[model samples]
Target chain A: EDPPACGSIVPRREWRALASECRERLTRPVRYVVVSHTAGSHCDTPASCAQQAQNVQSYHVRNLGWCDVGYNFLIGEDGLVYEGRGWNIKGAHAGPTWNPISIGISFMGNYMNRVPPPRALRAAQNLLACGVALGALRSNYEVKGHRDVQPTLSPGDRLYEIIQTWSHYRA
Target chain B: EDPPACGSIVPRREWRALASECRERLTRPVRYVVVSHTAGSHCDTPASCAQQAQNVQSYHVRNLGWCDVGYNFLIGEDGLVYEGRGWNIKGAHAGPTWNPISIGISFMGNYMNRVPPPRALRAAQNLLACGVALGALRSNYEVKGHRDVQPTLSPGDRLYEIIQTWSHYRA
Candidate 1:
């Protein structure tokens, strides 16, 4: 489990993050926020998003043998943020070095040939603002793509292009 | 709603806030937070609170010509914050003077004779802190009773007394 979620996004319990399946606390005032995406299944509505959220967690916990869903948070096309492991713990979204010092967030979609809806993009940005508000992310926190740290196309090309132009995005 | 109902309080929507035809927005970085009480019936359970909550709004919107519930927020004895007008609207609480500059929040029941439960107090404070985090409330925001700004016994005597001792409460 993570430390008490402060003025943050949707909580893990709301998304039904599996019980007692998380790892060590990652600590906060974290300087990095890595962005990614789930390329398998996507959801665009609240009702459908719930199942998609559940499916993501089940795959991580059941098939992957991982502690929980990889991202600290998941954004839905419905413009809602779903909680994964939360801010206080390490997430599997990024690799070991980045995981310990950064917060990883994934949009639950395949964005390579797709662009997240404006509202979905807004949710992600609002979530980063919330992290800053909670002191979980530094006021000058940097937003990085998953490809920046690892050799993967997790966040996808189109979405990556869009994020690079954001005010908070960094190399 | 941002905190999710779990570990926090009900979002105005799940409790049927969307039923509100309110189309108002409050000035941001509000200066004061006015506390008050229903002075009517109370409930300590979620189910009961939901019913009670519905009744409150029913009376306000259905009975009165007001667009929505009067206050900016409401605290339940069950330790949850029910969204009223929220932080972004000019609440109908107090008079026109305080309503614009201040955020009015009420206890779910009459607190003139009895103080609210401890959990309820915690939820109200937590809500205030979140407002500050979202930059809706000033870091140095003030708290006043509905009675303090008006010639009424609103907010109740017992609840008023407690708020006076709070760090942000002002005369």
Candidate 2:
């Protein structure tokens, strides 16, 4: 279950290429982009990293109704960003109203156990910034946790607090 | 199917006896009391009465992990208030955090389909008033429709508005 070395960062230029693909594929306006962290794994070690990544993929496909994963993108503990159900098509994550307008991105590994690796946090910030630049998001888009809408406690407590820390981090 | 004539109103003393029985049987503190009107004959008619009762009963049992129905009482279109799980036990009809401290009471017909028979509304009002007087409710107890919590068009729009008008009459 060991994951490969933390992969090289998806360079900003590469992210722009991905965003162009998303924009071409998307048919609907993407307004709010929400970020969620699993916070289930404690370390960036290979075994834990791989398990966390697999858990996110499995949880999204099985529990949430979608052709693939619900999130538009998933960032792993290995610091690699895995593309999910990319833009414009409906996402199964978030509440009914929010799903239609929001772009969802989740980070694998529960931060409740510990803070996310610095690389993963930066990647999330960078991804969001790129999304905004691509006109895929509103200037005031809200980055919220899973618990904000529904009652269940997914995306653990510590991770939610960490995500909140980005409230002041401009996209 | 046309509903049979509702039975005579339960006497105040009898209502008190039933409430006391419920208090003795339940294990939790009963806080807020909610009264809802089921607005569809398809889901709330006499033939389907027991089925409707069982729906709430099972929702509590399965979703909330409660022993039985969460509502303290259920009033049928026949104007008879059937005792539910009990008074002291927590209910499951409302949202999770809200349910444990609330008592749910539902009337088994969509009163908004047409004007409810005078007798049915009278019996329901009387029963609710009796519940309040017997200390089953506080002044702040909320009387709301099912739509208040989740997005359902339940308790017909017209009937819900009427209930709002009559809320001030609760003693």
Using TM-score as the measure, the top candidate is: 1
lDDT of prediction 1: 0.78
Can you give the DockQ of every candidate in the order shown? Answer: 0.07, 0.03
Q: Which regions in candidate 2 have their CA more than 4 angstroms from the true location? A: A1-29, A39-55, A62-65, A168-171, B1-171
lDDT of 1 by residue, A1-171 (tens): 122234235555655557747768887789999999888687765456667888998898899988888888888775557778877878988888899899998998899999987657756776787677668889899999999999898799999999999888998
Highest-lDDT candidate: 1
User: Number of backbone collisions per candidate, in order?
Assistant: 2, 6
Off by over 4 Å in 1: A1-8, A27-29, A133-135, B1-98, B104-171
Q: For candidate 2, lDDT tens digit of each residue in A24-54?
A: 2344446676666543444355445445545
Docking quality tier of model 2: incorrect
* Candidate 1 lDDT by residue in tens digits, B78-126: 5457878877888888898888899999899988889986557766776
Which lDDT values do the candidates have, in the order given?
Answer: 0.78, 0.54
Task: Give the C-alpha interface root-mean-square deviation per candidate.
Answer: 10.0, 12.8
Model 2: DockQ score: 0.03
